[PDB]
Design a binder for this molecule. Structure first.
Ligand SMILES: *[C@@H]1O[C@H](CO)[C@@H](O[C@@H]2O[C@H](CO)[C@@H](O[C@@H]3O[C@H](CO)[C@@H](O)[C@H](O)[C@H]3NC(C)=O)[C@H](O)[C@H]2NC(C)=O)[C@H](O)[C@H]1NC(C)=O
Ligand SMILES: *[C@@H]1O[C@H](CO)[C@@H](O[C@@H]2O[C@H](CO)[C@@H](O[C@@H]3O[C@H](CO)[C@@H](O)[C@H](O)[C@H]3NC(C)=O)[C@H](O)[C@H]2NC(C)=O)[C@H](O)[C@H]1NC(C)=O
Ligand SMILES: *[C@@H]1O[C@H](CO)[C@@H](O[C@@H]2O[C@H](CO)[C@@H](O)[C@H](O)[C@H]2NC(C)=O)[C@H](O)[C@H]1NC(C)=O
Ligand SMILES: *[C@@H]1O[C@H](CO)[C@@H](O[C@@H]2O[C@H](CO)[C@@H](O)[C@H](O)[C@H]2NC(C)=O)[C@H](O)[C@H]1NC(C)=O
Ligand SMILES: N[C@@H](Cc1c[nH]c2ccccc12)C(=O)O
Ligand SMILES: N[C@@H](Cc1c[nH]c2ccccc12)C(=O)O
Ligand SMILES: *[C@@H]1O[C@H](CO)[C@@H](O)[C@H](O)[C@H]1NC(C)=O
Ligand SMILES: *[C@@H]1O[C@H](CO)[C@@H](O)[C@H](O)[C@H]1NC(C)=O
Ligand SMILES: *[C@@H]1O[C@H](CO)[C@@H](O)[C@H](O)[C@H]1NC(C)=O
Ligand SMILES: *[C@@H]1O[C@H](CO)[C@@H](O)[C@H](O)[C@H]1NC(C)=O
Ligand SMILES: *[C@@H]1O[C@H](CO)[C@@H](O)[C@H](O)[C@H]1NC(C)=O
Ligand SMILES: *[C@@H]1O[C@H](CO)[C@@H](O)[C@H](O)[C@H]1NC(C)=O
Ligand SMILES: *[C@@H]1O[C@H](CO)[C@@H](O)[C@H](O)[C@H]1NC(C)=O
Ligand SMILES: *[C@@H]1O[C@H](CO)[C@@H](O)[C@H](O)[C@H]1NC(C)=O
Ligand SMILES: [Ca+2]
Ligand SMILES: [Ca+2]
Ligand SMILES: [Ca+2]
Ligand SMILES: [Ca+2]
Lengths: 779, 779
């Protein structure tokens, strides 16, 4: 009863089933003026008819093989749910009719003897919005429902759907796999689209939850349906166009993506790569050749294929007349041959060849969901077998006493179906968990266009092994992947382009972490990585390059010790020492000959002892350059004609006491200065407050000035061949040198702050011997 | 029939109803050894019994007032769904029993005359996981279901739930309101918790979708249930403890938050503020006084209260004996008085006072959902009224012919219920939209503890006007809000603390945009805002401050025009001019008196014409400082005793030709230099390649040196009171000055690169007159 398009066959134990022979109900909506009537289904699903044949075929195989359920035949009352909850509930209200005694004792059948004989276990409700609505009605009467296709995670809640097992993997793994793919191809800017029913809605939240532990920032997220209006479809395609993201993760069903794909083709939005859910990655509505402008390269998923023997030869044995136990055969015949079967449209002779036309009923390469239908009805058969072959004192019920077969109930088959452990025709073990589902391995496919009259071929490009360890589960042989149909290079679908090794990452306000700008950082930056979020600072003896990469450029070494700028002045000091020694020899052979020669040679020999990079001793040894000058300027008071002479320690010991007092105040330490930035590693010796200045003013500007007022009366007096005149000329040379010293010493730094003093001491002590020794010798 | 705890009363038109008298079914799960039986409900819901009394009371009011539905009495078959889909489906399978002809013609009642008289419109299914499961079964038979409490957005899909209207607002507005509150209090780091059924799951996705257009980054998102296990509850409280976010948006129901709230109290996780959904913000399971350590200050929502007259006096008229049409009264009596009614537990006399004990059945301050029950049954009455008072040729059905009352069907009441426009007892208009719901205004409450024996009082702190414009809908009078129970200051719940105006925002890799670090930016930074994501760069005449805020510090103005460093040298130049003029007057009164006085005064008067900030003319007027020196040094060849003399243009015109050729090569333009960074706005005049150097070497070092070999034979020759000797002394002064000029000119910059040349010209031209004019005058 119920609907009047059944597929019915009597038997001892009646199964029942629910299959999607059409794709939907008609678009007519009632205004409720007239009394409402049953809505008529519109499209046709040859894949759904193949699923129905796979159920019926395995029931004939169980009734054929006598090693499984002997002297007991299986019937079935297979209905058709046109992918709608109402058409499914009209069927599963006729499934539970004899069981409807427990609340309504007022059934009292009164229209049949066996009273619509009680279904033991229903196999069906493909959609997950349909299984959720049928498993609520098959949960009061405890009839087990073994669904072959519904694969949402809401149905794995065994406090509400108390009797629901399924032979298709959960979708907690597929939303992990679609994040592993996006992580593996190094994308971080994707968008999601999900069908608004119980399949896409809790299956895109798992992808959102598992693509933010990988940094898979989501761009947009829209929900579609198969009954959405034109404003909603236009809004979804405007969000697709208004964005810049090439990976679109579509977690939807077959005919829910149809109004979006039609309109995206009609508006020609090319470039995106569609990661596909399992429900539409092998679909005879989206894989159509004229959609291949926008739908190509769609890396999808598919379940593990099966092998059913004799099934393809059983599919061709169909007929609208020889099949008396199949009410859908006439509708399939008329829809596949464009006939009109008589018992615009020509009358059908009924002698056609089924292998002649091209249709998804017989043009298939792998059984994937049809094998799940076969496996579900074999699961119910292998539970009825264990009820059949149970010995007393051994079973599963209370006190081990198992139940009979001739009066078997639905909850006993549910109890045995929970504890199921059997083997297929492929040697695999099938067992339902505590949440009642199987576990399987996905085989990632790709959408290629066959270049000889073929529609679309699905080329397998890897797997997804769910048994392996977390992290190593995905294998993508990416030399078979044709990006957007024809290309070969992996497309760029990041948000902002990853900047180079000279720049850092700077963010925009109101945009995610996955989108930045990239600016350069200054002054000791050294962005050593490629995408560093903050470039560091260099060590103090290093400075950044021109391209702002790793700072291998060190700072200065400004010393000029043996350089060709200081070595020539050292040669001048050696020439002064040699010219002094050649006069000392002529003064020895041929106190003003001992001290005013020895300290005079010291003032020109220790003046070469202030070059190079200074240190503690080379920074404390600047005091002899004045202490020896104060003793070598004693000739101006010792060689005069106004001459008890060995009391030069009335000034030399004063200078020595000044030096011994000032060596603690002006410290014996070079001080490295930071005046420039790039190459500024200095050494400047940092005289304290007044020490060397007071020492110079009290010796080298005081003795030569106290000699000045004493020799100004003798400058116009020649004596001993004008010795006073030559002393005054050397004193004028010394005054010119000490006038030239101080401003050039004040207005220089570093390399040129010592080369003024060391040149001025040379220029004074060379004149103070060349004006005097030559005139005293050559006369 | 169905369940054997009904509330039944016969009548002409039977309504039906579904109410949550208990809170859930017992925790016993079947192992299916025994034959499974009906599970027994556990807790009690006095609020649910108040809702049942509000339905029954309005049915008595319709049967009482003769102005509404006269000569026609309303019955009801009210059942009890213990918040479970299975207990609701056992009831709504006994609602549709006479309507079960359309698919099963084999009903053929055979146990009643009227055959369980057909319910016209059911009122119930409070939960939104229960209304979704009952509206699928009341959508084949087109019975209208007017739910009073289910408020999810999945039920507003009129292609699947074809007959479902409701008198509670949708939850597309409440998830907007909870984002408006978080935006209004300036939070950006929240966490969400949602009950895993059809209420929290599509209601937290709307909050996630509307709290990322406001930048409301989400921290965590967990799903709970009332059947969750201890590992899941421990995981949720470990995510709450392991996070740092104080705003927790709980979108859940009453008894779904119970195992989380119990365990959070048992582990004492204090500090969080719980934004509440409407379902538990006024709940007699969470608002309990011992939970107030962690549950306080919970800014919730509540619907608009109603006024039902006579209802509180009707509630006290209940009795287990006088109520013959109410099967729940004995259970309510026994559960509220701890009795055991006879027809551990003492026997009940049945003479107690209902207003004596404290219970949520009678301790209420505002009718919110009870008014919705009243409004739903008045909606069905005001649709039956319009079927009653329809004139022919005027109705809503086909060709205007409306239907009778004595044979009325469910789809006619559905048609009239769609077109409903009536008025309450409060003067408000009630009309269902095209998606079949009402619109209402929320009244935001807060959870205060009453400090005299009270449990928890709910103090209203504002509203949420959904009729107003988008953006201005929320009004929070925040001087009534007690944060976490007692406090008064708004709590800080951002991710990272907003940094100051000296620093920028730097990001962390692997963390959202809402969390940053804050580093300082250098060298012309001027972070003018408070939380700028990138600090700008200053204009070139400005440099950054010490605190790196807005750069008001301008650069240098190094000129020294009228400063106390250049004005004293200008006074020295004026003194040189005056001392030259006083000698010119004594040479006039008492060509070497004309040219060697006029050009000599020019060389000391135009030497003050090179001070200040230079410009085109003040940078081209450096050439007279050599052109006048070459003409004023002509005295050294014009005043000698070896003296056709007016051919000084054999050198002065050569210098003039050099200047006229070099004024284009060395350009007349000051060049601003950038040698330092902070205060470095310079002017340096940028001599070209060799122009001034060659001019100086060809005039001022050439004439004085060609005079040298001519006057070296006359230096030992006194003539005209030693004029040659005084000329040689002035030439030695000039040679000393031009030896002191060049190194101090080379080793300075800017302010000290002109003050060396302008001092050296003064020192040369003062000596070249003071050595000569004084000896020529005073003799
Ligand atoms: C889109 O943005 C992505 C950021 O999420 C980029 O992903 C980055 O790719 C890098 C390779 O180009 C990865 O570097 C790897 O780092 C690990 C250590 O973390 C090393 O062992 C690997 O050797 C190294 N890879 C190579 C080739 O050297 C980054 O780790 C990775 N970022 C993250 C967060 O994982 C994408 O590159 C970018 N897209 C494009 C096209 O550039
Ligand atoms: C948590 O982070 C939030 C960032 O999302 C901070 O929110 C910022 O608060 C500022 C006020 O303190 C807002 O400034 C306002 O800016 C508008 C113009 O955009 C002006 O008209 C207002 O006058 C100005 N407010 C004041 C008081 O001057 C920021 O706009 C706002 N950020 C955003 C993105 O809106 C929170 O402040 C922060 N929490 C705490 C406690 O600081
Ligand atoms: C799951 O997928 C994997 C890979 O696609 C399959 O694992 C292989 O199984 C064969 C047969 O046992 C082994 O010889 C290989 O070594 C396996 N590959 C590995 C471990 O990488 C497996 O057949 C699939 N199906 C199931 C049910 O596990
Ligand atoms: C919705 O909420 C608002 C504010 O809580 C209420 O609006 C006020 O209504 C009264 C009566 O009409 C007016 O006098 C006020 O001016 C309104 N306030 C405004 C416009 O800010 C309103 O009563 C609530 N209910 C409905 C059904 O709108
Ligand atoms: N899991 C799918 C059902 C499904 C799997 N494969 C399919 C192929 C076609 C149609 C539906 C399916 C759903 O929830 O809807
Ligand atoms: N909308 C709630 C129903 C509800 C509203 N208020 C309530 C108060 C108590 C219990 C349930 C409710 C839900 O979907 O579940
Ligand atoms: C798309 O972008 C245009 C231009 O900014 C804008 O006008 C339009 O509203 C956008 N549409 C959507 C859906 O964002
Ligand atoms: C869509 O665009 C592609 C490439 O731009 C082009 O080949 C194709 O013909 C277009 N189709 C339509 C219908 O505009
Ligand atoms: C043993 O089995 C009988 C019926 O088979 C049952 O009534 C009884 O309770 C059982 N006893 C135990 C201890 O299991
Ligand atoms: C039962 O199933 C388990 C795995 O689920 C398997 O290891 C075991 O071999 C099965 N039992 C038998 C008897 O095959
Ligand atoms: C909480 O933090 C601790 C310490 O880092 C960690 O060991 C634990 O696994 C965390 N738990 C969760 C649920 O994040
Ligand atoms: C929980 O903590 C609060 C404050 O720390 C304290 O007042 C209260 O007594 C605690 N309760 C328990 C059970 O530890
Ligand atoms: C008028 O009404 C009759 C019955 O009331 C109906 O059969 C007929 O179709 C209607 N005609 C029009 C034009 O509405
Ligand atoms: C019908 O409802 C509208 C608003 O929905 C209201 O404006 C109008 O007044 C109502 N009709 C009557 C007759 O009150
Ligand atoms: Ca398909
Ligand atoms: Ca934003
Ligand atoms: Ca409650
Ligand atoms: Ca991260």
């Amino acid at each position: 009863y119920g609907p009047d398009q059944r597929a019915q066959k009597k038997g001892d134990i009646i199964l029942g089933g629910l299959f999607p022979i059409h794709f939907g109900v008609a678009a007519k909506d009632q205004d409720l003026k007239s009394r409402p009537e049953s809505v008529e289904c519109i499209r046709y699903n040859f894949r759904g008819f193949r699923w129905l044949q796979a159920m019926i075929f395995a029931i004939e195989e169980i009734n054929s093989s006598p090693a499984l359920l002997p002297n007991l035949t299986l019937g079935y009352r297979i209905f058709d749910t046109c992918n709608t909850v109402s058409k499914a509930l009209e069927a599963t209200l006729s499934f539970v009719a004899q069981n409807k005694i427990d609340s309504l004792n007022l059934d009292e059948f009164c229209n049949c003897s066996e009273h619509i004989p009680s279904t033991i276990a229903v196999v069906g409700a493909t959609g997950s919005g349909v299984s959720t609505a049928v498993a609520n009605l098959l949960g009061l009467f405890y009839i087990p429902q073994v669904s072959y296709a519904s694969s949402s995670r809401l149905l794995s809640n065994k406090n509400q759907f108390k009797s629901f097992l399924r032979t298709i993997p959960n979708d907690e793994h597929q939303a992990t796999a679609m994040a592993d793919i996006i992580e593996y191809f190094r994308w971080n800017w994707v968008g999601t689209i999900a069908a608004d029913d119980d399949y896409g809605r809790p299956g895109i939240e798992k992808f959102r939850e598992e693509a933010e532990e990988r940094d898979i920032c989501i761009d947009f997220s829209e929900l579609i349906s198969q009954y959405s209006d034109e404003e909603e479809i236009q809004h979804v395609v405007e969000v697709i166009q208004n964005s810049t993201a090439k990976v679109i993760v579509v977690f939807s069903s077959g005919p829910d993506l149809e109004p979006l794909i039609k309109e995206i083709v009609r508006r020609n939005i090319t470039g995106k790569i569609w990661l596909a859910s399992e429900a539409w990655a092998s679909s005879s509505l989206i894989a159509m050749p004229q959609y291949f402008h926008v739908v190509g390269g769609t890396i999808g998923f598919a379940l593990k294929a099966g092998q059913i023997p004799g099934f393809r030869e059983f599919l061709k044995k169909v007929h609208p007349r020889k099949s008396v136990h199949n009410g859908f055969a006439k509708e399939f015949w008329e829809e596949t041959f464009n006939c009109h079967l008589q018992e615009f449209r020509p009358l059908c002779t009924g002698d056609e060849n089924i292998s002649s036309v091209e249709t998804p009923y017989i043009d298939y390469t792998h059984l994937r969901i049809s094998y799940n239908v076969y496996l579900a009805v074999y699961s119910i058969a292998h539970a009825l077998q264990d009820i059949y072959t149970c010995l007393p004192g051994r079973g599963l019920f209370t006190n081990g006493s198992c139940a009979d077969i001739k009066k078997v109930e639905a909850w006993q088959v549910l109890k045995h179906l929970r504890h199921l452990n059997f083997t297929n025709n492929m040697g695999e073990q099938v067992t339902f968990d505590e949440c009642g589902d199987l576990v399987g391995n996905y085989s990632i496919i790709n959408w290629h266009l066959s270049p000889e009259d073929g529609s679309i071929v699905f080329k397998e490009v890897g797997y997804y092994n769910v048994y392996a360890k977390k992290g190593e589960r995905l294998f993508i042989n990416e030399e078979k992947i044709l990006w957007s149909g024809f290309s070969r290079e992996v497309p760029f679908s990041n948000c902002s382009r990853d900047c180079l090794a000279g720049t850092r990452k700077g963010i925009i306000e109101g945009e995610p972490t996955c989108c930045f700008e990239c600016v350069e950082c200054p002054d000791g930056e050294y962005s050593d990585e490629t995408d560093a979020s903050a470039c560091n600072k260099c060590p103090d003896d290093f400075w950044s390059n021109e391209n702002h990469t790793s700072c291998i450029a060190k700072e200065i070494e400004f010393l000029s010790w043996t350089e060709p700028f200081g070595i020539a002045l050292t040669l001048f000091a050696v020439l002064g020492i040699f010219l002094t020694a050649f006069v000392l020899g002529v003064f020895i052979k041929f106190e003003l000959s001992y001290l005013l020669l020895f300290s005079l040679l010291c003032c020109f020999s220790s003046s070469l002892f202030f070059i190079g990079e200074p240190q503690d001793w080379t920074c404390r040894l600047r005091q002899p350059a004045f202490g020896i000058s104060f003793v070598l300027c004693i000739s101006c008071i010792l060689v005069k004609t106004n001459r008890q002479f060995l009391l030069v320690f009335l000034c030399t010991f004063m200078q020595i006491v000044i030096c011994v007092i000032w060596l603690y105040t002006a410290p014996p330490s070079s001080y490295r200065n930071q005046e420039l930035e790039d190459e500024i590693i200095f050494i400047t010796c940092h005289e304290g407050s007044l020490m060397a200045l007071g020492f110079l003013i009290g010796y080298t500007c005081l003795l030569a000035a106290i000699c000045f007022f004493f020799a100004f009366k003798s400058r116009k007096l020649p004596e001993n061949f004008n010795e006073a005149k030559f002393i005054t000329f050397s004193m004028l040379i010394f005054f010119i040198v000490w006038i030239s010293f101080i401003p050039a010493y004040a207005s220089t730094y570093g390399k040129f702050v010592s080369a003024v003093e060391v040149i001025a001491i040379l220029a004074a002590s060379f004149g103070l011997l060349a004006c005097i020794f030559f005139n005293k010798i050559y006369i």
